[PDB]
């Protein structure tokens with residue numbers, strides 16, 4: 001439930017993500033996996049990566065890092081009109097990957113952090129404002145969707 005103003009903000013800030021998607025993304029996931037060792041077990045793909053280095057050295061993680069941030073990017077552009085984009089990802093993240101709504105909070109926090117370390121001084125307060133809001137409005141809907149399939153509650 002954001003406005004144009006805050007949307008513009010989400011789009012502009014995102015414009016920084018675009019310039020280097022695999023970069024932002026590698027790190028997004030690397031933070032997640034490091035700060036929450038438990039998330040990495042849901043990936044038969046990266047369960048092996050013990051070290052953070054072994055994580056940086058891996059191009060597999062870069063690649064997914066891309067899928068991740070491009071689909072997300074795809075949704076933000078919809079400006080809340082993302083029912084179409086969200087669902088498939090809700091069901092898939094729910095019934096198949098079995099991703100607890102809290103894992104979506106972890107990563108949501110992953111982004112916001114990454115945006116800073118990566119852009120220290122150009123990720124203004126109103127931008128952070130805007131960035132939290134859409135990740136929220138996005139968490140919200142998955143959750144609405146997750147209550148449906150009755151996954152964790």
Ligand code: HEM
Nearest residue numbers: 039040042043045067068071072089092097099103104107
């Ligand atoms: C903005 C949040 C996320 C987005 C947009 C996203 C997007 C995607 C997409 C597009 C796929 C491939 C197609 C599909 O299976 O539907 C996928 C697969 C997957 N998702 Fe995510 N994802 C997100 C966060 C997470 C999180 C936090 C976890 C759990 C730690 C997770 C677990 C997985 C796994 C394990 C796969 C498949 C692994 C494999 O390829 O073997 N996702 N995700």
